[PDB]
Amino acid sequence: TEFIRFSGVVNPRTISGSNSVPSTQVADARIEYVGNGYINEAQNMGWLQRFFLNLSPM
Amino acid sequence: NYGYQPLFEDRRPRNIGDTLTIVLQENVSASKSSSANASRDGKTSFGFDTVPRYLQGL
Ligand SMILES: CCCCCCCCCCCCCCCC(=O)O[C@H](CCCCCCCCCCC)CC(=O)N[C@H]1[C@@H](OP(=O)(O)O)O[C@H](CO[C@@H]2O[C@H](CO)[C@@H](OP(=O)(O)O)[C@H](OC(=O)C[C@@H](CCCCCCCCCCC)OC(=O)CCCCCCCCCCCCC)[C@H]2NC(=O)C[C@@H](CCCCCCCCCCC)OC(=O)CCCCCCCCCCC)[C@@H](O)[C@@H]1OC(=O)C[C@H](O)CCCCCCCCCCC
């Protein structure tokens, strides 16, 4: 599953025509596009590799 | 809200809660160069390979 969530503050004067406003005109833009399942799990580093990345010298 | 709002003005932000759009378009570039050189060359020679009898003393 994919979750696309948006949050922000919109001035009720930049809304143009068909109730549409570009995200660049929204203050406090919070945009999340996350996924689940093994497809998302395959994009995680892995505990040992993450530890080496954060601690291993060079 | 009971506040006064002009009709013909450009709707600039005026209060604490007002929102404004910022276009970064930042571009800075600085460069610096310097060089110096100094060359001196000298080379002197002198030789008879044949000396007159009267000059053999010197
Ligand atoms: C800015 C201007 C300011 C003014 C500057 C003034 C001049 C500033 C000084 C310039 C002259 C340099 C001095 C060199 C001798 C010296 O003092 O400094 C030596 C160390 C070097 C220091 C120099 C640093 C300077 C620092 C720089 C300073 C610059 C400013 C110590 C030394 O002494 N070392 C020494 C030692 O070595 P060892 O250590 O190992 O033991 O012993 C061995 C063995 O001795 C030899 O044995 C031979 C036999 O075997 C024997 O012959 P034989 O006949 O017997 O057979 C033979 O006898 C003979 O020559 C026989 C006979 C030859 C006659 C032939 C006709 C030549 C005429 C030639 C005519 C010359 C025309 C100019 O003599 C002479 O009448 C010499 C002529 C005198 C001319 C006088 C000028 C009148 C003005 C005439 C004016 C003309 C007007 C137009 C024996 N020769 C000797 O004894 C040595 C000496 C005997 C002295 C007794 C004679 C009366 C001196 C009477 C008075 C002299 C006082 C100065 O003669 C000389 O040269 C003297 C040259 C003087 C020139 C000055 C000019 C002034 C202009 C005046 C200007 C104001 C030598 O080889 C060795 O000397 C050598 O190698 C030298 C080599 O040869 C010659 C190379 C010259 C290249 C140019 C330098 C190039 C160097 C450049 C790099 C630095």
List own/partner pairs for A44-48 with CB under 8 A and 24 or more apart.
Answer: none
| Cβ <8 Å between A13 and B21 | no
The DSSP code for A27 is E
| C-alpha angle A53-A54-A58 in degrees, rounded to nearest 5 | 60
Q: Give the Å distances, CA to CA, from A15 to A18, A28, B42.
A: 8, 16, 82
Our measurement of the distance from residue B8's CA atom to the centroid of its chain's CA atoms, rounded to an integer in Å, reads 48
Resolution for the entry shown, Å: 2.2
Give the residues across from A33 on adjacent strands: A4
Comparing alpha-carbon positions, the chain B residue that sits nearest to A28 is: B19
CB atoms within 10 A of CB A26: 19
Helix and strand numbers (H, E) in chain B are 0, 0
Going by alpha carbons, the residue nearest to atom 134 of ligand 1 is B58
Q: Distance (Å) from the C-alpha of residue A39 to the closest C-alpha of chain B? A: 36
